Design a protein around this ligand. Structure first.
Ligand SMILES: *[C@@H]1O[C@H](CO)[C@@H](O[C@@H]2O[C@H](CO)[C@@H](O[C@@H]3O[C@H](CO)[C@@H](O)[C@H](O)[C@@H]3O)[C@H](O)[C@H]2NC(C)=O)[C@H](O)[C@H]1NC(C)=O
Lengths: 218, 218
């Protein structure tokens, strides 16, 4: 069996988004479809369930009125309609099969990420950084590559064809006020940095933007 | 909605050790047919959850036998005999006895090992940042363990907190360490006026807080 979910979505606050979960390889009308929310912070929250064969639906107290479940029997698809949105609703939404009191929820959808933000698509603005002048130089030294003022996710940061991959730490993107950023620091031998060329690559599939800014000593 | 409380919030255990996770219910979740419908799910990072145990006495197919379950009317626990690298993730308890059905809080699982001291670094802004009209002050704390980390932004003898970004990285695999990258966005008018910036951090390995600073005036 297989549960296929719709693609990623971006919506402005106050709008409504409808996402779908399509099931195949089993009797679609005879299984409940469970909708689960996972905010980036933590936790799995169950929104509710719908039985496509009938129109029966259940909602958790928190999401009553927020979500509306509908199902199409002709096409093995079920939908969840999210009402007026906010920044809080940004999360990854999952669909899963379920038959209460018997074999339970062994197949899940891949997940569908929903992002609520007033921002528009922005290209990455990578500003490579180098060690400060007022700092001692030793054998072990870190490197720096900063990407900021970009939207939406994801943006992949990697060195020149993986010139030096191990020893890097790409930190999760965060919003300063409205746009995402990213920090990636790696370590290289002091005797090799001024000799070997090391640079960070930036890719933005949504914006089709590729950047390559080498870092040189201050 | 039946509230399910899961403890501990985190569980560090070295490889091969016994792991115990407990899930408690706000009400009795027994069912008339002699079964109690409690299920345990594992969600490794970047993936949809998976089914491990249902009807705790029972166990799903295709799962290692080291997992086991037990409990009674309102208290249940899950046990992992021998821990392995693939067993890292977040474990949730799910009750399927009273409508609506609710997930557990979640019990993240880590692996404990010989802790390591932090390696701090500071990167002042770059030429591009200066030209743009800003100043990106980033202090990097790579390969440190455990989470007992607190970073204070002290500058020229004054502690600044506004504009302080907090974003760490999940536990690694090769090093099983943690990394911290906190950033302080500064403007040209404000960046130059300060003379000295310090990156202040504390950790359990070294009771005396560590210090790292540089002077703009050079
Ligand atoms: C609805 O009523 C039916 C009929 O009584 C119930 O079916 C019975 O369910 C029990 C509990 O699962 C079965 O006993 C179990 O059998 C398994 C497999 O043999 C065994 O490993 C367990 O230790 C336990 O003995 C029983 O076989 C089954 N009877 C029949 C005829 O299928 C059903 O549970 C009821 N469902 C609900 C929601 O009330």
């Amino acid at each position: 069996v297989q549960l296929q979910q719709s693609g990623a979505e971006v919506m402005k606050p106050g709008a409504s988004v409808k996402i779908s979960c399509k099931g195949t390889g089993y009797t679609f009308s005879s299984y409940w479809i469970e909708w689960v929310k996972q905010r980036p912070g933590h936790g799995l929250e169950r929104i509710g369930e719908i039985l496509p064969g009938s129109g029966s639906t259940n909602y958790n107290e928190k999401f009553r009125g927020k979500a509306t479940f509908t199902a199409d029997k002709s096409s093995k698809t079920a939908y969840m309609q999210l009402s007026s949105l906010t920044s809080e609703d940004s999360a990854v939404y999952y669909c899963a099969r379920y038959l209460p009191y018997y074999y339970a929820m062994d197949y899940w959808g891949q997940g569908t990420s929903v992002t609520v933000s007033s921002a528009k698509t922005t290209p990455p603005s990578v500003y490579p950084l180098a060690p400060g002048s007022a700092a001692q130089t030793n054998s072990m030294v870190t490197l720096g590559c900063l990407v900021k003022g970009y939207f939406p996710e994801p943006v992949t940061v990697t060195w020149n064809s993986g010139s030096l991959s191990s020893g890097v730490h790409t930190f999760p993107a965060v919003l300063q006020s409205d746009l995402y950023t990213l920090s990636s620091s790696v370590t290289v031998p002091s005797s090799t940095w001024p000799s070997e060329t090391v640079t960070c690559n930036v890719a933005h599939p949504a914006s089709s933007t590729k950047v390559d800014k080498k870092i040189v000593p201050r | 909605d039946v509230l399910m409380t899961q403890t501990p919030l985190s569980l560090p255990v070295s490889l091969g050790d016994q792991a115990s996770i407990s899930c408690r219910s706000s009400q009795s979740i027994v069912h008339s047919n002699g079964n109690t419908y409690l299920e345990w799910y594992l969600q490794k990072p970047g993936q949809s959850p998976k089914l491990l145990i249902y009807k705790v006495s029972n166990r799903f197919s295709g799962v290692p036998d080291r997992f086991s379950g037990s409990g009674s009317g309102t208290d249940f626990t899950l046990k992992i005999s021998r821990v392995e690298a693939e067993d890292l993730g977040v474990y949730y308890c799910f009750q399927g006895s009273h409508v609506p059905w609710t997930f557990g809080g979640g019990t993240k699982l880590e692996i404990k090992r010989a802790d390591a001291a932090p390696t701090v670094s500071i990167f002042p802004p770059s030429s591009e940042q200066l030209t743009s009209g800003g100043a990106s002050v980033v202090c990097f704390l790579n390969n440190f363990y455990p989470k007992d980390i607190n970073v204070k932004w002290k500058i020229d003898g004054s502690e600044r907190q506004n504009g302080v970004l907090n974003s760490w990285t999940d536990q690694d695999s090769k090093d099983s360490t943690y990394s911290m990258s906190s950033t302080l966005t500064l403007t040209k008018d404000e960046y130059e006026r300060h003379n000295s910036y310090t990156c202040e951090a504390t950790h359990k390995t070294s009771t005396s807080p560590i210090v790292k600073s540089f002077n703009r005036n050079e």
